[PDB]
Design a protein around this ligand. Sequence first.
Ligand code: B81
Ligand code: B81
Lengths: 276, 276
Amino acid sequence: ARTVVLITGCSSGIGLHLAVRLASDPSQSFKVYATLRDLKTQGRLWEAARALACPPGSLETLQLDVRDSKSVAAARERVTEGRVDVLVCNAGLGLLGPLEALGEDAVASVLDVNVVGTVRMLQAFLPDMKRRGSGRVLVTGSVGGLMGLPFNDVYCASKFALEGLCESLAVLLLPFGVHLSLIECGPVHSPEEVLDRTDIHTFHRFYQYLAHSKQVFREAAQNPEEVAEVFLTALRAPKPTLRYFTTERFLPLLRMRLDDPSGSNYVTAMHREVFG
Amino acid sequence: ARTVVLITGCSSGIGLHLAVRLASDPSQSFKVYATLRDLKTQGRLWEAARALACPPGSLETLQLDVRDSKSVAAARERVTEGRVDVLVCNAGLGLLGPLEALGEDAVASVLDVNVVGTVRMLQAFLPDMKRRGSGRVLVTGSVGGLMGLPFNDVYCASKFALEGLCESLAVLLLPFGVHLSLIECGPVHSPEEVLDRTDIHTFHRFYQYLAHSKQVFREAAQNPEEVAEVFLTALRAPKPTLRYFTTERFLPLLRMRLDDPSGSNYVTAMHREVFG
Ligand SMILES: C[C@]12CC[C@H]3[C@@H](CC=C4C[C@@H](O)CC[C@@]43C)[C@@H]1CC[C@@H]2O
Ligand SMILES: C[C@]12CC[C@H]3[C@@H](CC=C4C[C@@H](O)CC[C@@]43C)[C@@H]1CC[C@@H]2O
């Protein structure tokens, strides 16, 4: 009767703010399964549920570790209503660093959670929406998935993954009535050891990089309430595009990339942009 | 004295054709470590070495499984010359199929080999080139890494990975004197069970898809000798761009993607292109 939305990565951030945005929706039109990797981190989801008075039962938490498709099954399974109208693949790890300084493990995890996690979700939830010929899938994307960001190699590698993965799928899903969208956000409100794992020139660059992106964060970070609302623009659109941008800020920079397919104007721009 | 080139995925295909292209180079200017996942599949590399008369010692095979960074170390280690001038990350798995029909394992492997493999390589080989301020890294890319291809979701997911990964890196490597390039190729010279793992409409689409791409392959596949030669255009360029295209064929289609950042013109085009 109500629209059933299942969302991953709800402990904090986009997923949190979105989950309680949907649950407290005044029309009371949404049933929200907020998922989290561990139930113990559900403190902020509930505090924030209370504060926006979500009615009882507009909001349920499940454990869902996307690294593990037996968790994925056990949570599809807890879906009382036996369907999911709206699936929001939000779970995401970042990773910041000189590439030599990253552990092989962390690199593996970021791709497992971000890319393979999302693959597991879809495999679990797609087939049901496909039969039924209705379903909305929304995927938190990033500007890092649209253009390469120094020191965010693997992060970007995993964000691009999702562009390609979603692009491919969408060309197949066109006339199924099943709708997929990426929601592209820009930013959103120990040194010694990195020094161990690399040279001094890189490290100095890393420092330069962080001081730069401190600035952009302060001057350009959005409210997740502003971000969150872009997913309901998408989930209510009668004919949704494959892609939504939370901001136009990075559109001039993306275009430069898009008009120089050799990649190297964009390489120049982004270099001066971050190392002055 | 000679230029030392190390190349992964040499059993067949691009890596093979390239390895013996470099080794038989008439000027005799290259020393080629051809790597393969298993030494037992080295038959075609050698047959083809003989046929292009590579001199003795212009060509050496090592075992290099990129899923495993102890193999990676043990093969850096077999580099007699103690340096690598030119590193070519060529290893690649494809995966074709309805996404529900792929095993979670295969999905994991494709990303491990294609994306994480390449991450391992760089971590092993980058730092040395960075100190030295010289080094050429070349990465076999694909058109699947530039635009989403139905039924190649994970393939694409892994090819986009590499765009982002290489893009990020290149913005950092600009003034190190270390050069990274992607080499973008287009194509290059059991039903029952897929039917088990999915619906009938998808399967019919898969059939439509394969019949289409049969055609494009026949009408558009390049010689790997034509492809192979594009890597030496890159490895000899005094100032290399981040990206080389083996063909212009798919450039009109990429532009449409690039001028419609909502993704959805491209979604329309590629749909009519493959399902008529
Ligand atoms: C790289 C920049 C700083 C870091 C920024 C980036 C824009 C987008 C993101 C993604 C977000 O996850 C955190 C900030 C981060 C990583 C910026 C674009 C221009 C600026 O130089
Ligand atoms: C999707 C298409 C058929 C399959 C083609 C693709 C172009 C590039 C590739 C990558 C290559 O690995 C195999 C063929 C494959 C996968 C084509 C672009 C137009 C055509 O419809």
